[PDB]
Amino acid sequence: ELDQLRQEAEQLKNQIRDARKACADATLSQITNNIDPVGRIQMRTRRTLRGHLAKIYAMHWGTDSRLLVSASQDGKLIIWDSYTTNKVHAIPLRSSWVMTCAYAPSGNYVACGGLDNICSIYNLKTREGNVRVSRELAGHTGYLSCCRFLDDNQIVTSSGDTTCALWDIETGQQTTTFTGHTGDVMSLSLAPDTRLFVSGACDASAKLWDVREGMCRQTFTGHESDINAICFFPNGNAFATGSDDATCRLFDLRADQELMTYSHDNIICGITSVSFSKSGRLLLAGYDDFNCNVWDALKADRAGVLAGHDNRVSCLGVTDDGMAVATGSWDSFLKIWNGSS
Amino acid sequence: TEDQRNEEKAQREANKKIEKQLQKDKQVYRATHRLLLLGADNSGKSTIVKQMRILHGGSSGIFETKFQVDKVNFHMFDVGGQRDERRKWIQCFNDVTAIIFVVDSSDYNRLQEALNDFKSIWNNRWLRTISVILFLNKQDLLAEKVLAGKSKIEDYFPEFARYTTPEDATPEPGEDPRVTRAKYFIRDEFLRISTASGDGRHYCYPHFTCAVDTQNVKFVFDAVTDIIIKENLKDCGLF
């Protein structure tokens, strides 16, 4: 019985691996060998955002490419205006321990969560001038690692209960559950078309889930350790993950196989945050060594290094327009980086 | 562009209000010591947090209590709403002033698991600078278990026979030498784990808990006070 199912699962794993090998004909490294190299890009810190009393654990940019929201372990959600380095809202949190932070595409909401296992959605455009907890989504049996808004009313949250959840904010229930991950789901990236989303967990696997159907289409396993960061390619047919294994890896959804493995012998620290550039040519990865690396997503070359943080780099996000990359670290600081011609 | 100037002035006023509130929050925050309760289910960690809540004013995810001892604020939290995977959510406690590690010294079967847990907490990359207040608990049941019952400790730790009570044992006046030997042995196992690595960065404060609650509060207070003394002396350089 159980032995037969185990053997059948092993046979299916072997068949999937054989199909992936059959698709592997010319690696992305050889395909991009002749392309002109990205060059030595250098980003200077235009604006350092200060005001947090504890370590920044997450941040997320707004669609406006100007307003961001950052979560600190002191129990504070601060919305920053990068253009003027001013704080618009400093929401106190009921639970000090916050590990995820979301900004709605419309700018009318923010979301936070963490060891309280609760997704708190805060309304910003309230009748009064005070930002209040619009809704406290509950139901997760583990710490909330990532929150990503979809359409102002539905939110996808990845948790430490090894499951992700699509919530209806108005009702407050689980519209959909996404099960299958064996470890803690830590990173979450929505597709630009909102139909699909990829989740990186602590089982060294990244799973592509269908939002409206609620099942896992694809499972990608190339990492030797737990994935901390995930980011969709702007095209929507690829995604990059970073692990505590000191590697980032690029996977394609249409080949069901990894394309390139950005790694170096000097890098021993794990990757915490990962995001692409506007065109996907640059892959920005935050590390535990208090540093960030900008790789060529097609060449696996360290195009640049962002070094301004005294503690672990916890989050980094690239604006919607690609204007700047904002990196928040455990030194209670967020730095906005941009390149000068 | 008068409207733009007005909007900028309003933004600056809101920012000033936010900074003032943030300074008040920092006033409350840096004067509060956040202790992290860590232990197994057998250990009376929940009992400890309940007793500390009932003694002072006090205040399912995380069980959090806030209390005042000698006008010094403490914030003790036990993480009980998670799974066994703690390699990711322990990272949230790298700024914690002290980890109160409660151990059940009476149960020898899981004492090795407690030692492993203490070792992993001690040798973490994100807990290298966090001092641990050891809380050997259930001392009365340890006394009852070593006075009689023939539940030998050497079955689980075959170094008990090759172990002598330390000269600096300062035990209770009525303690049987056997119970002093056992309690020490456990304390020295944890202390060997502590002094194996990271002695300079952080230190362990053994305490034989399950005594009167006031003694536990007082030991936590004194341990926290030095910890702050070490930190401030490292910052000043008089170390």
Partner: nanobody
Amino acid sequence: QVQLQESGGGLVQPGGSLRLSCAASGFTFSNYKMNWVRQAPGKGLEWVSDISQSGASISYTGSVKGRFTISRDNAKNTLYLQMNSLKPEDTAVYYCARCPAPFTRDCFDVTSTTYAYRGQGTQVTVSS
């Protein structure tokens, strides 16, 4: 994909010797500290032994100290545990649990109920 397929294990009379060999594939063996953990019937997962990245730091639980000797062959990407003078309290399922992160000395999620970097294990039944 990370795989840690254990081997060995069977019916052994008390006092006998075994050698469990865990073959590891999908990750660089040398960079990861490893640890043999056992689950006895009607009991939780208990850590038995651990090996550092090369072999400098080797530790055993007290109940198996001297009896078991654990070694690592990096070239073959295998981890062995040698059982000597078995006792009936050792009847358990043995798993080769890899420490979650490379290049470190703290291993947290080993011996957890659901750990992603251990194998199915082998059944060792020390009985007569």
